[PDB]
Amino acid sequence: EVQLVESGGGLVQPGGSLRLSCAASGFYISYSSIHWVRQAPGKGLEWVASISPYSGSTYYADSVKGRFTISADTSKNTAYLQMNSLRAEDTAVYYCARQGYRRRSGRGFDYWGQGTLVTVSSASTKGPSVFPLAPSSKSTSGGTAALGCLVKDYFPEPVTVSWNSGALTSGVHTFPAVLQSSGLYSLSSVVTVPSSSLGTQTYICNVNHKPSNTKVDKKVEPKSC
Amino acid sequence: SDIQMTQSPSSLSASVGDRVTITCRASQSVSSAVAWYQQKPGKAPKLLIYSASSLYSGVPSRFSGSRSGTDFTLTISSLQPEDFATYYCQQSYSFPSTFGQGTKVEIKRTVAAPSVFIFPPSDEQLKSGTASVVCLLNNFYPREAKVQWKVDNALQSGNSQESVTEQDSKDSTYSLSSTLTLSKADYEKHKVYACEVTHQGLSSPVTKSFNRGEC
RNA sequence: GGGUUUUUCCUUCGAAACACGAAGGUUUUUAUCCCUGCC
RNA sequence: GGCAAAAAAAAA
Secondary structure, three states: OOEEEEEOOEEEOOOOOEEEEEEEEOOOHHHOEEEEEEEOOOOOEEEEEEEOOOOOOEEEOOOOOOOEEEEEEHHHOEEEEEEOOOOHHHOEEEEEEEEOOHHHHOOOEEEEOOOEEEEEOOOOOEOOEEEEEOOOOOOOOOOEEEEEEEEEEEEOOOOEOOEHHHOEOOOEEEOOOEEOOOOOEEEEEEEEEEHHHOOOOOEEEEEEEOOOOEEEEEEEOOOOO | OOOOEEEEOOEEEEEOOOOEEEEEEEOOOOOOOEEEEEEOOOOOOEEEEEOOOEEOOOOOOOEEEEEEOOEEEEEEOOOOHHHOEEEEEEEOOOOOOEEOOOEEEEEEOOOEOOEEEEEOOOOOOOOOOOEEEEEEEEEEEOOOOEEEEEEOOOEOOOOEEEEEOOOOOOOOOEEEEEEEEEOOOOOOOOOOEEEEEEOOOOOOOEEEOOOOOOO
16 A cells, blocks of 8 residues: 655756655655665665654765755655755666664665656757567568567657557567667667467557657558568 | 675576575674665565565565674575566665665576567658668577678678667566667668577577568 | 762663653762761 | 661763
């Protein structure tokens, strides 16, 4: 029943400011310690801050105080993280975590949100152009064949892509975006399906890039017979 | 006096049914205030072990911790595919709290040959003038596999980008995309574009390709 | 040594790392406190 | 043997 939801991250310029929020449901934040733990792309986890109950006392990592500040509004059952003087090293996924009950779990973090990505960059946001990559039929492809959508030239991360609007999930592979020499990201997402059923069904991908604020759906077909 | 946690090893690989052990050493006394977390790629960590040795409610019995002074281990008694993850140890004995640098556990399985596909550039993308030949290796193991591009049988270099999914939650395979970035000018220049791969599920390299406009 | 009066320290608990609270613990610093009268 | 007195403050 317990759930935490981070929001408020995204792209910010170096020196900029950001306020992260953490919306708690299923438990009251007044009776636990709440922590922010951050994770850089592909690096490990880094503790950042926390506040403790009743006192309200706060604590920070050395890489972040003077700049970050953790608070909680208990009437909105929400914990915040005010971020000033932002720098490229602050680019990370930021989690908010609940420290479990002492008898039940000691000092462990028993519940985590899913993180909000903060991108500290001087660059400006661009949405992607999604191109389909088409299956190979001979006249039908005897068993199974593959197809996918190319998502090219966007910034920053992330995008989310969904085939038949979440209906098709088996055999999906959305590859990790890699950064072209251009400074834009591009990834591919491919699904495999029985060729038997290739021509009787339509294959759609819903790419979405909330930074850009682009929602495009392109739909894949073979070529001419 | 910031305590430092030293996690051993960084990456390891064992088969299913294997017994695997991760270690962490505290730079100084952290009593028993140490937790272990499982983090699968893309989603958030999950508590496995709190209080150095106690098993958090819901976690399978095969994960276990224990402590010798400042030496903390997390052993997983019988590795399983679902257990591919990155594991982080944490001390919460003092502020600031400190994580280990992590252990990325992969899984050993039988060699699986990649199923290879080639996709020509579609021309909404040559509607705006550049070319997106892409290769696909679906569901294979092991990871280390090389993919060569040619263009009227010309070896290519410095115009290829590859990306490989994480290892699968359930069958342990990988998959990989190699994509060649070139002009519209270089795409009517030549006629056929070959993709070949030398992986050890291949007798010798399987190759797939196409013509320009023959479908 | 035995005490009085004050602090700290430690342990379990209170939704509880500090702060606040409840119940507990057996130690030792003071030419920086008292160890005196009455059948 | 039996009653009575007395008396400030720090630390693990």
